[PDB]
Amino acid sequence: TPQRVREAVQEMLKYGLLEESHKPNLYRSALTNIEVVDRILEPLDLAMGVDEVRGLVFVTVRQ
Amino acid sequence: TPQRVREAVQEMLKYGLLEESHKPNLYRSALTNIEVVDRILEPLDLAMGVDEVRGLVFVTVRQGEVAEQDDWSHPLVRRQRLNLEQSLLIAILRQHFIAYEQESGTGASQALVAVDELIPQLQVYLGELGSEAKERNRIITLLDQLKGHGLVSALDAHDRVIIRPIITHLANPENLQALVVWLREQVEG
Predict the structure, then answer these.
(1) Which chain A residues touch B76 with a CB distance below 8 Å?
(2) Residue of B nearest to A1 (CA)
(3) Cβ distance of A6 and B43 shorter than 8 Å
(4) CB contact (8 A) between residue A40 and residue B43
(5) What gap in Å lies between CA A58 and CA A47, rounded to an integer?
(6) How many whole angstroms separate alpha carbon B34 and alpha carbon B19?
(7) H or E stretch including B6?
(8) Which of B42, B57, B80, B90 is the most buried (most CB within 10 A)?
(9) A13 contacts on B by Cβ (under 8 Å)
(10) What pairs with residue B49 in β-bridges?
(11) CA of A53, closest CA in chain B: separation in Å?
(12) B45: alpha, beta or left, given left = phi > 0 and alpha = psi -120 to 50?
């Protein structure tokens, strides 16, 4: 598991959201690794939602 | 991922610890899945400690490949640090817990200590205040601050407090040795 992917996952789980204007590196890491983030968050019953209009990465309770 | 594993991990993260005497099923679910929980918590820089003698499952900050981390700069840590007065009170509570545990056998019990018993022992170190009310309020404030870290419980109607078992892992001989070395360095300069 890449270090950048782990850092982005930690930041997303902590702050609950990711913005490209604030953290371009984590946003790019998570945007290009959507399948990786989904696989990571599946055991936690969580899913990642992406709004590329505003560069907003959020978490939703998958069900 | 099994439902029991996810539920146990989420509950343990929510509360910070799992005790068999309170949550036996969750304790059984988490104890038999050491590798699964380790894999789950590895990306989050967290680790699981198990004490089957005391039947406790606790969560600690995983040690990365850094010589000094201070163990408080982790983003998910919300607790504040511990000063000398709280540390001395914790040491007193650990001595009392050792006394309670040595004369203990088969059966379920808890470590209960009254405030008035602890009053003179801490008076020996800190000193003596003019009024008993001032000392009692100081003790109450210290106990409340320590309860904010999940080490004791709320005072009962008979002026007693219950010591949580986690202090045993908080006051392990390695941490005690580190604190003793640090205090020795502080006093000598």
Answers:
(1) 14
(2) B43
(3) yes
(4) yes
(5) 9
(6) 16
(7) helix B3-15
(8) B57
(9) 44
(10) B58
(11) 28
(12) left
**CA distance linking residue B4 with residue A59, whole number of Å:** 22
Q: Experimental method for this entry?
A: cryo-EM
**Alpha-carbon distance B152 to B71, whole Å?**
22
Residues of B in contact with A1 (CB under 8 A): 43
Asked if B34 has any chain A CB less than 8 Å from its own CB, the reply is: no
Q: Are B12 and B18 in contact (CB under 8 A)?
A: yes
Angle at which helix B84-102 crosses helix B115-126, to 10 degrees, equals 130
Interface of B with A in 62-91 (CB under 8 A): 75-76
Taking the C-alpha atoms of residue B15 and residue B12, their distance in angstroms, rounded to an integer, is 5
Determine the Cα–Cα distance for residues B97 and B80; give it in Å rounded to an integer.
24
DSSP string computed for B103-152:
T--SS---EEEEHHHHHHHHHHHH---SSHHHHHHHHHHHHHHHHTTTSB
Instruction: Mutation target for A interface from B44, B45, B65, B74: give the one with most A CBs within 10 A.
Output: B44
The residues near B118 (Cβ < 8 Å, ≥ 6 apart) are: B89, B92, B139
Our CA dihedral for B169, B171, B177, B183, rounded to 10 degrees, sits at: 140
HSE-up (13 A, CA, CB side) for residue B151:
24
Those residues with Cβ within 8 angstroms of residue B77's Cβ, 6 or more apart along the chain or in another chain: B61, B71
Chain center to CA of A2: 14
- Declared resolution, Å: 4.1
